């Protein structure tokens, strides 16, 4: 009924408030509609940067550790393909 979805956002560092509003505007595009987003902040320093949004239904891994791992896998698949 009410357009509220609960999520857990995990970052490497404690959030700045401009970082908070930019992350909120980034994470409002993963929800279905103009839903209000009630996030909970956590800290994981194994994440190097970015964020991991943990919904109950789904996961969005926009961390930089997942990015460099996808980078290394893509580079390895190209240099073994060539």
């Amino acid at each position: 009924h009410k357009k509220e979805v609960y999520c857990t956002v995990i970052t490497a560092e404690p959030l700045d408030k401009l970082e908070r509003v930019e992350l909120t505007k980034k994470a409002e595009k993963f929800v279905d509609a103009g839903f209000k987003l009630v996030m909970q902040e956590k800290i994981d320093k194994k994440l190097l940067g970015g964020f991991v949004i943990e919904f109950s239904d789904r996961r969005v891994d926009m961390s930089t550790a997942k990015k460099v791992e996808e980078f290394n896998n893509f580079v390895n698949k190209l240099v073994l393909s060539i």
């Binding site: 560092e13 700045d16 408030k17 401009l18 970082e19 930019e22």
Partner: protein, 441 residues
């Protein structure tokens, strides 16, 4: 009775044999140096091949062959660097003059033999009274250009150069060694400059002393710039580049010496632009910019483009500590200009990366209207190795050449910036430097 191709033919038949001992190779190299053989490269190749193959080296043949290699201008790193084995095995058997010549040749060639330079520096500082000042100047030049930052030998040599009067060639060699070591002592360099009053035996001595004064951010001697003005034609174009570069870095205003040096080096680029290294053409652009003396227009545009190339090449192959320092100084510059949140800091740091007019990349370049500020982070590699730790002459060189492109250059050294405990104090330091250089920002 007097035939130089015939004696070269006999030397070539001597070094083409099946078994040539080290005495014969040493004598062939010494004769090739005394005959001043530069056009016959294959004869020097045969001599260096037989020098590499020779296995019975005593003190005299090793010393004479290393003298001949160092004096003839013959560089082949494999043979000379494998000649360090005879040097280490004969180092107790060497006299002070022979140890001097051997360490000078193996250091000027660039041999990375830490055991050789450590044992030689231990020999020299162990008995410093047995060595006369030309010998400790050659050993200091050897351990300096062999990659050893031996400050015990530099202190002992500075004590001797303050106590004993030296020749101008000895002082120029010692200044060149201290300029590679990055030691801007005022006790030693003042003695080595007061020795530069009896004239110069060679123009390469005055050129090396001028380059060494410009590197250590001293001011030019009038005798050195006068000896460079008198005999500028005795230099190679790369030596003329380093002479004019050290004169411009030292702050000399003698337009006649710069005119002579540029008239030496500028037809060499017109004959072959690709003859000199790009670092030498960048040094020529620095000298032409700071001195203000002109060049030919094609030569001036070419050395401007080559300065852009050399700055870009020094930025691409930059050390990682210098990259971290540039990132830290850029973050402090972003915080000093009104960024208290991490995305604002990252966006400002990425916005500071701008393209120079000569095609190179400036890391921290802020513009306001028509005013430009270039924050220049200086790593510890470009600082003076002595305990005051000032930036070297190349830092002021880059500052003056960027100022000629209309950039107010704020110099941020590594020690002063990394002395601060937090980012707010670092932003205060960077903002104080920018306000000291350009108060409009």
């Amino acid at each position: 009775e007097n035939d130089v191709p015939a004696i070269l033919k006999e030397i070539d038949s001597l070094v083409s044999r099946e078994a040539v001992s080290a005495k014969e190779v040493s004598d062939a190299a010494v004769a090739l140096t005394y005959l001043q053989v530069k056009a016959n490269r294959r004869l020097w190749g045969k001599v260096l091949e037989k020098a590499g193959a020779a296995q019975d080296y005593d003190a005299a043949s090793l010393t004479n062959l290393l003298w001949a290699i160092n004096t003839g201008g013959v560089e082949h790193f494999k043979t000379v660097a494998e000649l360090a084995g005879p040097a280490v095995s004969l180092l107790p058997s060497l006299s002070p003059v022979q140890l001097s010549i051997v360490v000078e040749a193996l250091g000027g060639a660039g041999v990375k033999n830490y055991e050789l330079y450590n044992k030689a520096s231990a020999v020299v500082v162990s008995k410093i009274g047995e060595f006369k000042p030309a010998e400790i100047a050659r050993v200091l030049y050897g351990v300096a250009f062999g990659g050893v930052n031996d400050v015990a030998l530099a202190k002992a040599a500075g004590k001797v150069f303050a106590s004993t009067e030296v020749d101008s060639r000895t002082a120029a060699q010692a200044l060149y060694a201290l300029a590679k070591l990055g030691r801007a002592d005022k006790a030693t360099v003042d003695a080595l400059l007061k020795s530069f009053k009896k004239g110069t035996e060679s123009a390469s001595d005055a050129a090396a002393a001028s380059f060494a004064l410009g590197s250590l951010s001293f001011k030019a001697e009038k005798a050195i710039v006068d000896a460079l003005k008198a005999s500028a034609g005795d230099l190679a174009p790369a030596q003329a580049v380093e002479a004019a570069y050290g004169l411009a870095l030292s702050g000399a205003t003698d337009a006649e010496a710069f005119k002579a040096l540029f008239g030496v080096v500028a037809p060499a680029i017109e004959k072959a632009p690709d003859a000199l290294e790009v670092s030498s053409l960048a040094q020529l652009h620095v000298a032409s910019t700071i001195s203000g003396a002109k060049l030919p227009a094609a030569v001036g545009s070419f050395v401007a483009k080559a300065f852009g190339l050399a700055a870009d090449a020094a930025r691409l192959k930059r050390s990682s500590a210098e990259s971290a320092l540039v990132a830290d100084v850029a973050a402090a510059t972003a915080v000093a200009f009104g960024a208290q949140y991490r995305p604002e800091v990252a966006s400002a740091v990425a916005s500071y990366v701008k393209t120079a007019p000569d095609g190179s990349v400036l890391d921290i370049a802020i513009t306001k209207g028509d005013a430009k500020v270039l924050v220049q982070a200086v790593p510890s590699s470009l600082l003076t190795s002595t305990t005051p730790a000032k930036p070297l002459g190349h830092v002021a060189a880059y500052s003056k050449v960027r100022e000629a492109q209309g950039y107010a250059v704020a110099v941020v050294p590594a020690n002063e910036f990394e002395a601060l405990p937090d980012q707010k104090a670092k932003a205060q330091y960077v903002l104080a430097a920018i306000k000291k250089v350009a108060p409009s920002f």
